[PDB]
Amino acid sequence: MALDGPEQMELEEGKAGSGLRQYYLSKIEELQLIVNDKSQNLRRLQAQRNELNAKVRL
Amino acid sequence: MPELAVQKVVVHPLVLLSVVDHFNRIGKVGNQKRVVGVLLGSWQKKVLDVSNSFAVPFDEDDKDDSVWFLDHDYLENMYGMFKKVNARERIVGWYHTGPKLHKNDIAINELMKRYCPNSVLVIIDVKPKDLGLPTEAYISVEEVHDDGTPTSKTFEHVTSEIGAEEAEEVGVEHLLRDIKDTTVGTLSQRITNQVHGLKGLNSKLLDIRTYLEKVASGKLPINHHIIYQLQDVFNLLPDASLQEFVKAFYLKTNDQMVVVYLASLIRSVVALHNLINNKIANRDAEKK
Amino acid sequence: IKDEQKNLKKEFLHAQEEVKRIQSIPLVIGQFLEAVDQNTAIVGSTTGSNYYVRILSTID
Amino acid sequence: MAKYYTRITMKRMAQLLDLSVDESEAFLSNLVVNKTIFAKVDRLAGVINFQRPKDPNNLLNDWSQKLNSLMSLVNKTTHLIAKEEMIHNLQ
Amino acid sequence: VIDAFRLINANMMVLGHEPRQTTSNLGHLNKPSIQALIHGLNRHYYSITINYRKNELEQKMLLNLHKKSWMEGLTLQDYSEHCKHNESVVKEMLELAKNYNKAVEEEDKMTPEQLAIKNVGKQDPKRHLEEHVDVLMTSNIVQCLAAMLDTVVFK
Amino acid sequence: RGLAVGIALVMYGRMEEADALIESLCRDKDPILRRSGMYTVAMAYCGSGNNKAIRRLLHVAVSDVNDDVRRAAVESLGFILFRTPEQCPSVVSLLSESYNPHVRYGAAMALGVCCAGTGNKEAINLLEPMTNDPVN
Amino acid sequence: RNDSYTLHKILPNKVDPLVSLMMVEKVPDSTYEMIGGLDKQIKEIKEVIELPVKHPEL
Amino acid sequence: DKKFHGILDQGEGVLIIFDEPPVDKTYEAALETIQNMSKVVDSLYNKAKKLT
Known part of the structure; x- marks a missing residue:
């Protein structure tokens, strides 16, 4: 990617090359994406566990 | 001799641990040759508190179960010492290390009765029997069965449970490196117990059926009590009714959800605009 | 962290049990004299000794 | 008779006493007053009810009691069974 | 020590x-x-x-515990006892319900402890009602599970 | 001690085979055996990033509280984690939060071993309150 | 800390016997209003008490 | 007034006395609890307006 909207015209370095380059990337990118959404849950679980761990250990 | 001063037998965790530990100490026998040892505990009470156990070297053969060695001399000498420790410690009976009782056990019992004032044969097992009790307590009884059997000396069960003492109980917690997912104090523990319950029932339930078969064929003598009790279980049966839960749990939880969201709605504009100015500030601040 | 939190729940009970022994008898009776703080308080006993005492969480 | 039979027809009770329905009715009137056993008697002739409140509450508590004893029974029986099971020492 | x-x-x-x-x-x-x-x-x-x-x-x-604990959980808790618990739970709930009702008019701010002083006493009245609903829930859980379970298995 | 600690060393550089060893050693009696069960997976994988190993070390330590296993478990993470030094505090912060000297002991150690070469600011800072504490 | 009878902190509570005394007997406090309109009478009690305690200089 | 807790049955012209107690304690109190909640959820609806 040096874009993600619609542009260019095909050559297998044109729209076809760019469009296929994006799909080769998308499998790698998906792992990046699920984790950024995952971070919100992780902190929720973290705050509650830190209070709970401090009380039981105390 | 009396076997009297028992209606209940509670056994300490000390008793079990002493037998596995003592196996290595003596000879590293390891239930290759079954061991009988003294069972020590309290007296002048209706309930029997088995405070303690020590091994006596007893080897019973695996060629033959009628031959054994039992070291008598140790018993008299150990007697005087028990008072040095405490004056509540006297010889209550004997222990069998299992895996099971014998007919041979009546003969082992007559020797031990001379010392004790309340002899009982309690099988403490070197292997823990399941997740249940690793101990079963029995007492020697003269009884007839209407199976056409005249007078026998046999072992009929008396209720066993596990007890503890104030000193000992504390010490157990410290030693333990388990945390207990089977504590059974609360709802979290209680749900585990129900899953296990069903599994427990199944393990017990199989035995009852094989016993019934043995009487039928593969001839085994009928213990009349067992048959009498079995028939009782099936007759009480009724069918189920009601029990349900309300929508109320949700309502409270939703209440918490509103409060935060209202605080959020006023804060939003403030917090989101400011972010861009602080963001820029941070990157520069970090360098120094 | 998820499984951990469940683990920690079991620890709370274990702990609760252990403390409970300490918590019970021998227990002396005072009168609640005054509050220095809400973590330590002053209570005055019935042989006349005034005590600086910690508050054990198992009440409000 | 009253304690065993939750329900009897007035008519059946007469056959059981070997006295007519009318005579049995008068006896019960006197009996209920002494309070030896509670009864409800009808002059309709439908039924004589002994120890029934006509509430679901009774059935709910009764239902529970039978199941509660049963669990207790299984766990005790198996202890004795364990002794039988070993074999070659009985036989 | x-x-x-x-x-x-x-x-x-x-x-x-x-x-x-x-x-x-x-x-x-x-x-x-x-x-x-x-x-x-x-x-x-x-x-x-x-x-x-x-x-x-x-x-x-x-x-190691007991053989007997195996059936203990299974045991069908009496309706009678349950009913005692049920009666006990609805009555506390009603008292608190009022408090809950006044409490929600305010509480525009976060920080739940401050809401506890305001609604009066340690802990929020919403939390008090839940605590009671939960205790009943625990009694109910053993009874209902047990009720079907017992009847089917012995039968 | 000499032999339990030796098992890890021979097993060096086989990586995956070591997985099998941590569980078995723990299954054996004494606390000593269990301790050096934590060291084997860590020595073997030697700077390779492996998800499964970190999970097991963490779970064994939390689930069953034993002095030998909790100290050893934390310490091992610093070796698997060695290859990238910045990632490490975020995992390790949770063990440091738990009040217990043995857990603290490894959590501190773990930061020193990983960060040893190319370090990071945050790592060093975490150690200081434990140094200051009256618990030896 | 009664582990040696050694002083832990100095206590920020320190009960005054003068306050106790005032309480046990019971005085419901009042003000000038209650008698109010006998101006000379209130003015005289202020002269004697108030001025020599607050400022002894007067 | 319920001063014997019975019912007079007109369709036979017979009087019946039975155990037919008014209500019961769990349900009576619960009825009042479910009512109160209805007012609370309404309040929650007003508060809730502000989000949208």
């Missing part, structure tokens, strides 16, 4: 000093509060630590 110790020689102190016992071992030196205990320690002996030996087998013995 229990401690193990080892005697220290008079000649050892002068030349060696007490930190010589500390070498080539764990070397934890105990303080059992102040007072006589500590003072006597210092003049007399070196105290050394306690570890517990354990074995897997040893644990297994301790953890």
Whole structure:
């Protein structure tokens, strides 16, 4: 990617090359994406566990 | 001799641990040759508190179960010492290390009765029997069965449970490196117990059926009590009714959800605009 | 962290049990004299000794 | 008779006493007053009810009691069974 | 609180000093509060630590419960007893319900402890109602599970 | 001690085979055996990023509280984690939060071993309050 | 800390016997209003008490 | 007034006395609880307006 909207015209370095380059990337990118959404849950679980761990250990 | 001063037998965790530990100490026998040892505990009470156990070297053969060695001399000498420790410690009976009782056990019992004032044969097992009790307590009884059997000396069960003492109980917690997912104090523990319950029932339930078969064929003598009790279980049966839960749990939880969201709605504009100015500030601040 | 939190729940009970022994008898009776703080308080006993005492969480 | 039979027809009770329905009715009137056993008697002739409140509450508590004893029974029986099971020492 | 110790020689102190016992071992030196205990320690002996030996087998013995607990959970809790609990739970709930009702008019702000002082007393009235709903829930859970379960299995 | 600690060393550089060893050693009696069960997976994988190993070390330590296993478990993470030094505090912060000297002991150690070469600011800072504490 | 009878902190509570005395007997406090309109009478009690306690200089 | 807790049956012209107690304690109190909640959820609806 040096874009993600619609542009260019095909050559297998044109729209076809760019469009296929994006799909080769998308499998790698998906792992990046699920984790950024995952971070919100992780902190929720973290705050509650830190209070709970401090009380039981105390 | 009396076997009297028992209606209940509670056994300490000390008793079990002493037998596995003592196996290595003596000879590293390891239930290759079954061991009988003294069972020590309290007296002048209706309930029997088995405070303690020590091994006596007893080897019973695996060629033959009628031959054994039992070291008598140790018993008299150990007697005087028990008072040095405490004056509540006297010889209550004997222990069998299992895996099971014998007919041979009546003969082992007559020797031990001379010392004790309340002899009982309690099988403490070197292997823990399941997740249940690793101990079963029995007492020697003269009884007839209407199976056409005249007078026998046999072992009929008396209720066993596990007890503890104030000193000992504390010490157990410290030693333990388990945390207990089977504590059974609360709802979290209680749900585990129900899953296990069903599994427990199944393990017990199989035995009852094989016993019934043995009487039928593969001839085994009928213990009349067992048959009498079995028939009782099936007759009480009724069918189920009601029990349900309300929508109320949700309502409270939703209440918490509103409060935060209202605080959020006023804060939003403030917090989101400011972010861009602080963001820029941070990157520069970090360098120094 | 998820499984951990469940683990920690079991620890709370274990702990609760252990403390409970300490918590019970021998227990002396005072009168609640005054509050220095809400973590330590002053209570005055019935042989006349005034005590600086910690508050054990198992009440409000 | 009253304690065993939750329900009897007035008519059946007469056959059981070997006295007519009318005579049995008068006896019960006197009996209920002494309070030896509670009864409800009808002059309709439908039924004589002994120890029934006509509430679901009774059935709910009764239902529970039978199941509660049963669990207790299984766990005790198996202890004795364990002794039988070993074999070659009985036989 | 229990401690193990080892005697220290008079000649050892002068030349060696007490930190010589500390070498080539764990070397934890105990303080059992102040007072006589500590003072006597210092003049007399070196105290050394306690570890517990354990074995897997040893644990297994301790953890063991009862055959009887197997049926205990299963047991169908009486309706009678349950009803006592149910009555107890709805009555506390009604009292608190009012409090809950006044409480929601305000509470535009976060920080739940402040809401507890305002609604009056330690802990929120929403939380008090839930606590009661949950206790009932626990009684109910054993009874209903048990009710079907028992009937089917013996049958 | 000499032999339990030796098992890890021979097993060096086989990686995956070591997985099998941590569980078995733990299954054996004494706390000593269990301790050096934590060291084997860590020595073997030697700077390779492996998800499964970190999970097991963490779970064994939390689930069954035993002095030998909790200290050893934490310490091992610093070796698997060695290859990238910045990632490490975020995992390790949770063990440091638990009040217990043995757990603290490894959590501190773990930061020193990983960060040893190319370090990071945050790692160093975490150690300081434990140094300051009266617990030896 | 009664582990040696050694002083832990100095206590920020320190009960005054003068306050106790005032309480046990019972005085319901009042003000000038209650008698109010006998101006000379209130003015005289202020002269004697108020001025020599607050400022001894007067 | 319920001063014997019975019912007069007109369709036979017979009087019946039975155990037919008014209500019961769990349900009676619960009825009042479910009512109160209805007012609370309404309040929650007003508060809730502000989000949208």
